[PDB]
Design a protein around this ligand. Sequence first.
Ligand SMILES: Cc1nc(F)ccc1-c1cc(Cn2ccn(C)c2=N)cc(C(=O)NCc2ccc(Cl)c(Cl)c2)c1
Length: 299
Amino acid sequence: KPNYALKFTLAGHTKAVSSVKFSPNGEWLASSSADKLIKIWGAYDGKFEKTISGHKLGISDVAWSSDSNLLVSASDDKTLKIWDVSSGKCLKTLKGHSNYVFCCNFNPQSNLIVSGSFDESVRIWDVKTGKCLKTLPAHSDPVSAVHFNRDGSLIVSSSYDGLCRIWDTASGQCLKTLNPPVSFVKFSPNGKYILAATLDNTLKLWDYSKGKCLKTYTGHKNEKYCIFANFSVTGGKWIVSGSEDNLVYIWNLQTKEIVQKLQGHTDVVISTACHPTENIIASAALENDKTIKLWKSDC
Ligand SMILES: Cc1nc(F)ccc1-c1cc(Cn2ccn(C)c2=N)cc(C(=O)NCc2ccc(Cl)c(Cl)c2)c1
């Protein structure tokens, strides 16, 4: 069992925190917020580094490029923005969605960005030009998550419509459809499995090639919000997720037993992230809390 303990509470956002992500080189934590700002924090000392501003409405999501130099943010102003982290400057504004942009990610090469929107579409953008390359009529309800697999050849998307769809990046064509609302989806690190959250207090680990569910994780509270979930792989093999009972849940991946519930937040833990090399979790909560917490375990 892990023994995550609170190391830092990061305060500064003035509305709900929407997403936290560690940079791939492990050095930074980025946070987005309904307060229209991105904040950058030291991953190991918790130290506030800078605020990045420019969006006209709340930010739902942020994601890092592979070299840790760029960020992309998704916003209720219906755009995404590409940021140079070291200068804080907006490089591109990605325009095209007809409703709030909810989720975003770079591919491993980081020449592409994928986005999902309340307009029920998934878009694929060129990082260099900022132009939309493809619009996928992906779903029949808001898109809750978008994720590239390990080499970027595939995109997985999820939606309130209850579907999880896998797309061929190069052509935009749908390869597989896996119905309670699906509130989150992500590829496993090797790209073989998919972790999917549904709004019936349930996480499931699917085999992608087989199209069958392998494990089911329950005990948390998730019926209203799209809550990030993670594979923790630096120590023991865990599943990590937030919860609407203000706790961070950690399951043993193989046995599906809840092995730790992290107490401290005073609102829904909407986002969790796992550090790329250290046994460190970042968690962030909604507007009655507005803080980010950094936790460290020996295993
Ligand atoms: C707090 C905040 N502030 C802003 F300014 C803008 C957005 C948000 C926000 C963030 C998250 C976490 N998050 C973000 C990206 N990703 C992949 C996530 N999991 C979730 C929600 C949510 O649950 N909103 C209702 C809802 C229910 C069902 C569906 Cl289907 C959808 Cl799409 C949304 C809202």
